[PDB]
Amino acid sequence: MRTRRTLRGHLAKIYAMHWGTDSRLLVSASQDGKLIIWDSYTTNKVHAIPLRSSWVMTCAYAPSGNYVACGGLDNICSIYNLKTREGNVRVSRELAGHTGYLSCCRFLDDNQIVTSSGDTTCALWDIETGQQTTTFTGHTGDVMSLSLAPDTRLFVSGACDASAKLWDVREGMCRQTFTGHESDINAICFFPNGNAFATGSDDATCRLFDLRADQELMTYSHDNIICGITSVSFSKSGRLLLAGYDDFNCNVWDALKADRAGVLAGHDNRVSCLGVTDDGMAVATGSWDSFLKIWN
Amino acid sequence: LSAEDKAAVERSKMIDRNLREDGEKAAREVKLLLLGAGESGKSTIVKQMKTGIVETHFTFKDLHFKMFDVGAQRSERKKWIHCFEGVTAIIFCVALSDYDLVLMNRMHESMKLFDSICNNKWFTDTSIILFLNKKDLFEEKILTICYPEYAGSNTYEEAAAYIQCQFEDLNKRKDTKEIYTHFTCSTDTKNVQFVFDAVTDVIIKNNLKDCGLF
Amino acid sequence: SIAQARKLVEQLKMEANIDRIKVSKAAADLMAYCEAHAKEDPLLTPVPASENPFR
Amino acid sequence: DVQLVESGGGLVQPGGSRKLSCSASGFAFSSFGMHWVRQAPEKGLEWVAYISSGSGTIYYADTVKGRFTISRDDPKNTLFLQMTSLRSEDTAMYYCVRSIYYYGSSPFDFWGQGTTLTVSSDIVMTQATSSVPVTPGESVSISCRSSKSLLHSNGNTYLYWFLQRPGQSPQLLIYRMSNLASGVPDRFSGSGSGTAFTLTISRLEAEDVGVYYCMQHLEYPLTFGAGTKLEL
Amino acid sequence: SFEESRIVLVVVYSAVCTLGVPANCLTAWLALLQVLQGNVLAVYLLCLALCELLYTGTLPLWVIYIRNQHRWTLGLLACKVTAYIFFCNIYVSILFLCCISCDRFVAVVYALESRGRRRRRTAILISACIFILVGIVHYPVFQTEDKETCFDMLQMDSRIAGYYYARFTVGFAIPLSIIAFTNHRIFRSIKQSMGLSAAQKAKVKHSAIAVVVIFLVCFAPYHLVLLVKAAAFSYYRGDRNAMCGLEERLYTASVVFLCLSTVNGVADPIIYVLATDHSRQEVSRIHKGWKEWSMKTDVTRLTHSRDTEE
Ligand SMILES: CCCCC/C=C\C=C\[C@@H](O)CCCCCCCC(=O)O
């Protein structure tokens, strides 16, 4: 429940993070204009990415690890090849098919990339053609975050509709309509089982859902917690729910009961991103105080 | 603990030196936030200093100016307005001859936008600059269509004083914030002179806080 | 704004085929998934120092 | 892709000095670390010199200290190495080598053409036999026998194995005992314990001929293996 | 007469030290509290705190060891080290005030140049040069030892007083000129600037003139009783050994000036928290945190107690 290492970030601010497949390396995204691939054990940065567009709000690390995706409000998604013959980092192709701000990019597969944008719709992209194969419409609000299943077949996205809409990747078809939120879904996360998911939003209430149930199992709310929720993540075995908050501290609620199991108050600033490794040894927390911190 | 670890240390030192140099190079440039509304004279203002947001860079004397034009965003403003928390100045453009155009007149809704952007929490202390546009047409055509509450003469000076006064009355939670207003003639040579003196005054007053003086 | 509703309501009617579960069985999935990976969970059952590489 | 062309590898008076340099193009040599490897006219690759990306750390061998010098040039994008006090053992077929260093990087991946230079403790590794007669289609194995264990405290051993095609630049087959290199068929696979090591050549055909080498990467004085010929 | 006035003065020295020590001890910690999100003035006031209270605290230590009537139980090595600390602390404090005022000038007037030069590494550069200059001044002071009375002396020759006049000129007058120059240029650059309000203009005028006035009224009359030596000893009219009343009046003047200079020395970290406006808010939240970790409010304890008694 204490800090084990402190990356201290790179230069200014930190918005989003994504744990790699190796479970040793992470990607850090920030408004400064530099994307940094980090090492957890050695506390040494292993890659630096300049950005043509300074404004970036999302980052994705591929499950293979060959590619990393960064994008922002410029309407252009940039996918960079980490492993090149030159050894540099070069954007594979520009992805400019949205009229809004690219809120969250996620890597279904090397070929198939899912992007959520301010155009109030999502679209599957192919790297070879740079063309949308399936465009998921229906979200009235601008889709702010999507969570992908482990199977990479069914995924859910969330917007400023106070609702979540499931999507099938193959046919571009809305699969479920989840409702129960009172405010904009700031972030969404998928259960590692693939059968459920829980969300948090600005109404300071975390909410658990199941894809087939389409129903609220139980809400996680505290009277002292008026602070809105910016990040949600899960343990590998359940019985845990790590959650960022607007109160400048992170909190850990039990998945089944939501007691005040863990109080997490290291970061001085708003916890922008909260990520857990795929095997689950450590939790990484990032914020706009320029600091990245990994605890256990 | 071998040659691989020593080499990783050297590379990690290398990228940090490069990062520090790039940050020091970037810190000099002055960031400006343009908030042009429709036919507010965006083409005019970009000509006078000479699918997402449009970035421009103009150099005045010894000072660099990077200004980001948020144009045709077509999205909820709150979700990305805080990305410009660190900006030094917010430039506003408002047409003056839009007092005869109803979509809710454009002046009233522009006032509401100014009230919202002034009264927010992030912009507690950010200096606000506002420009004007189409004032010669406004003086030529002119009152009762948009502001019957004036009950004053259609004289351009008197009417323009009334309009600018009411717009500067939108200083909500702006005790620390300043409203530099300007009678933009739309043909004045360097209206960036107002911007340079305004940003210079802001830099001076913030330098006092940097020393702890004020 | 009259047209926007049209493709919306078919989007409702294409969700007539909602899959169904029971919320108690839905939470039964949640609890039964726990003990499968609880032997490798280092948050409720933290790994001791020899098996822990984060020291 | 990449280009490494060495410059002016010729005759040198005994004990004298001569500037050698691998002209470089097509890669981020600013961000890449560089090595040099000697090849005696018949047998024996051994490491010579190291220059890092930031030109901060300079590592030499037992006979290499002082009498050699290394240098670089980032705007013109090339690599220099000056050698003084050249004798018979100092004559070798030096190969300009690039090697980037981080987690999962593949050092010693690309090589040049060579320096035709003719004039006029330490970890010990030896492969068992230097000659193995083979048949095009049956699986063989060759073993490099170290003298100390290569298993570091962090639980990951450091061990890189090399193939040399007859007359040209060598390649990297497998790095740190478990990871095949790019552009290499899967038929080659290293194996062994933390102290004893052996190859797994499977279904060899008429491009695997050449000499095979081993290397440690647990101490800064890197020393390759003796080399093993795989004749048909 | 001299012995009783000296002993009550050094009792008041002990009292001033007891009243002043925790303020400078906490001052160092607050300077470390700002050094992370710190400007040039933060680490400069950090070095000022690290140059403060060492002699100001240890002066009463050797007072209460032996109440000074020129008794030296030590080997006098600590008294020479003592003088080396006292004089150097005075000189670094005054020229540090001069250099913070110069940095204020270069920030206010040459605002474009300053931001690049305001790295904290550039802040800890000139300080060592100031100290090593004082050290070269003090090297002859170490050499000119006659194995005689060092507390006070007066003579026709005034070789030591001639060196002290040189130290006065090289250490006091030119610093005063620098201080006056930068503050009056601050005055003019403020009054020609119209964007800043008149009330804020008056407030910075009051703060800067207050700092200049306290520096003047404390250190300068001491400098007057140093500069009187040149004329008075040169004509022999201000030097008669048999007519001891002149030595008496100069000694009483010197001990009173030393008392008020030590008062100003104590007041320098007090001035560091008084005149600026930000310090009011920072001291307010420091008081709030002190009350929070002290648990002196006990309001929740009071609620629990009134619940338990019923
Ligand atoms: C004139 C009547 C006799 C009583 C003595 C009066 C004043 C003595 C005043 C002292 O500052 C002078 C002592 C010399 C100290 C040398 C300082 C060295 C330095 O810190 O740079």
CA-nearest residue, atom 5 of ligand 1:
E152
Which single residue is written with the structure tokens 């050092």? D107
What is the rounded radius of gyration, in angstroms, for the C-alpha atoms of chain C?
A: 23
Q: Which domain holds residue B82?
A: 29-206
Residue of D nearest to A82 (CA): D105
| Whether the Cβ atoms of residue E123 and residue E43 lie closer than 8 Å to each other | yes
- Answer whether residue D126 is part of any domain: no
Distance CA E141, CA D193 (A): 74
Contact C14 A176 (CB under 8 A): no
- Which atom of ligand 1 is nearest to E153's Cα? 3
- 3-state DSSP percent of chain D in helix, strand and coil, to 5: 0, 40, 60
Contact yes or no for A239 and C38 at CB 8 A? yes
User: How far is A218 from E9, CA to CA, in rounded Å?
Assistant: 75
- Which residues lie closer than 8 Å to C6 by C-beta, 6 or more apart? none
Q: Tell me if residue E118 falls in helix, strand or coil.
A: coil
What number does CATH give the domain A1-295?
A: 2.130.10.10
CB of E141 shorter than 6 A to ligand 1: yes
Residue D68 and residue D147 in one domain: no
As a whole number of angstroms, the distance between CA C17 and CA D61 comes to: 74
The single-letter DSSP state of residue D131 is: B
Q: How far apart are CA A181 and CA A201, in angstroms?
A: 8
Q: Which of A34, A74, A160 is opposite residue B52, by nearest beta carbon?
A: A74
CB-based contact, B26 to chain E, within 8 Å:
no
Could you state, in order of their start, the residue ranges of all structural domains in chain A? 1-295
Token representation of residue A269: 């600033």
Q: What is the rounded CA–CA span in Å between residue D206 and residue D137?
A: 9
Instruction: Tell me how far apart the terminal alpha carbons of chain C are, to the nearest angstrom.
Output: 60
Structure tokens belonging to residue C20:
């169904």
Cα–Cα separations (whole angstroms), residue D181 to A205, B138, D151, D224: 50, 74, 21, 18
CB atoms within 10 A of CB A32: 22
**What CA dihedral angle connects C20, C26, C28 and C32, to 10 degrees?**
110
What is the resolution of the experimental data for this entry, in Å? 3.0
Distance (Å, whole) CA A93 – CA A110: 13
Q: Domain E2-280 maps to which CATH number in 1.10.3720.10, 1.20.1070.10, 3.30.420.40, 3.40.50.720?
A: 1.20.1070.10
Chains A and C touch (3+ CB pairs under 8 A): yes
Can you read off the two tokens belonging to residue B166?
Answer: 């009411």
- Tell me if residue C43 falls in helix, strand or coil: coil
Which of D103, D106, D156 best tests the A interface by mutation, with the highest count of A CBs <10 A? D103
The beta-carbon neighbor of B211 closest among E41, E115, E200 is: E41
| Structure tokens, A78 | 């940039």
Using the beta-carbon criterion (under 8 Å), do D103 and A46 form an inter-chain contact? yes
Collapsing DSSP to helix, strand or coil, A38 comes out as strand
User: Residue E200: which of B24, B210, B214 has the nearest Cβ?
Assistant: B214
Half-sphere exposure (Cβ direction) of B183: Cα atoms closer than 13 Å: 13
Contacts of B8 in chain D (CB under 8 A): 101-103
Least Cα distance to D3 among A91, A86, A84 occurs for A86
Chain breaks in chain D (C to N over 2.5 A) after: 120
Between strands B179-181 and B127-133, the pairing is parallel
From chain B, the residues in CB contact with E39 under 8 A are 210-212
Mutate to test the interface with D, among A37, A85, A90 (most CBs of D within 10 A): A85
- Are D64 and D156 part of one and the same domain? no
Nearest to D47 by CA among D64, D32, D33, D72: D64
DSSP state of C46: P
Phi, psi at B165, each rounded to 5°: -65, -45
Q: How far is CA A183 from CA A161, A163, A206, D127, E275, in A?
A: 8, 9, 12, 69, 47
Q: How many structural domains comprise chain B?
A: 1
Domain assignment present for residue B103? The answer is: yes
Nearest CB partner across the interface for C37, out of A138, A195, A236: A236
Which of E93, E153, E249, E256 most suits a substitution to test ligand 1, by most atoms within 8 Å of the C-beta? Answer: E153
Residues 6+ apart with CB under 8 A from C42: A280, A281, A296, C52
Closest atom of ligand 1 to CA, residue E250: 2
Q: Do the chains E and A touch each other, judged by at least 3 C-beta pairs below 8 angstroms?
A: no
CA E2 to chain centroid:
27
| SS3 label, residue B22 | helix
Which atom of ligand 1 lies at the shortest distance from residue E247's CA? 2
In degrees and rounded to multiples of 5, residue D99 shows phi and psi of: -160, 110
Q: Is residue B6 part of a domain?
A: no
Out of E130, E164, E241, E258, mutate this one to test ligand 1's pocket (max ligand atoms within 8 Å of CB): namely E164
Residue A23 carries which DSSP code?
S
**What does the DSSP 8-state code read for residue E169?**
I
DSSP D224: B
If you write DSSP's letter for every residue of E221-277 in order, what string do you get?
HHHHHHHHHHHHHHSSTT--SSSTHHHHHHHHHHHHHHHHHHHHHHHHHHHHHHSSS
What CA–CA distance (Å, rounded) separates D101 from B11?
8
Widest distance between CA atoms in chain C: 67
Distance CA B62, CA B32 (A): 16
Q: Which chain D residues are Cβ-neighbours of B2 within 8 angstroms?
A: 152, 158, 217-220
Of D55, D20, D12, the residue nearest D34 (C-alpha):
D55
Return the closest-CA partner of residue B16 out of A11, D99, A52: A11
How far apart are the C-alpha atoms of D42 and D130, rounded to whole Å?
13
DSSP B60-97: ETTEEEEEEE--S--S-THHHHGGGTT-SEEEEEEESS
Pairing relation of β-strands A241-243 and A250-253? Answer: antiparallel
Coil/strand/helix, residue E136: helix
Contacts of residue E179, defined as CB under 8 A and 6 or more positions apart, other chains included, come to: E97, E98, E101, E212, E215
Task: Check E204 against B62: CB less than 8 A apart.
Answer: no
Q: E164: Cβ below 6 Å to ligand 1?
A: yes
The CATH number given to whatever domain includes residue B128 is 3.40.50.300
* Integer Rg of chain E from CA: 23
Task: Report the SS3 class of residue E50.
Answer: helix
Verify that D9 and D113 share a domain, yes or no: yes
CA atoms within 13 A on the CB side of D142: 27
CB A31 within 8 A of CB B82: no
Residues B90, B123: contact at Cβ < 8 Å?
yes
Assess D104–B contact: CB distance below 8 Å, yes or no. Answer: no
Closest CA to D109 of D46, D161, D50: D161
* Four-residue CA torsion sign, E100, E105, E111, E113: negative
Of A92, A85, A56, which is closest to residue A73 (Cα–Cα)?
Answer: A56
The total domain count for chain D is 2
For residue B35, the cross-strand partners are B92
What residue has token string 């030119």? Answer: E174
Same domain, D114 and D8: yes
Which uninterrupted H or E stretch holds A201?
none
The single-letter DSSP state of residue B191 is T
Residue B44: helix, strand or coil by DSSP? Answer: helix
Fold of C1-51: G Protein Gi Gamma 2 (4.10.260)
D60–B contact, CB cutoff 8 A: no
CA of E225 to the centre of ligand 1 (A): 10
Q: Which domain holds residue D149?
A: 131-230
* CB of E247 closer than 6 angstroms to any ligand 1 atom: yes
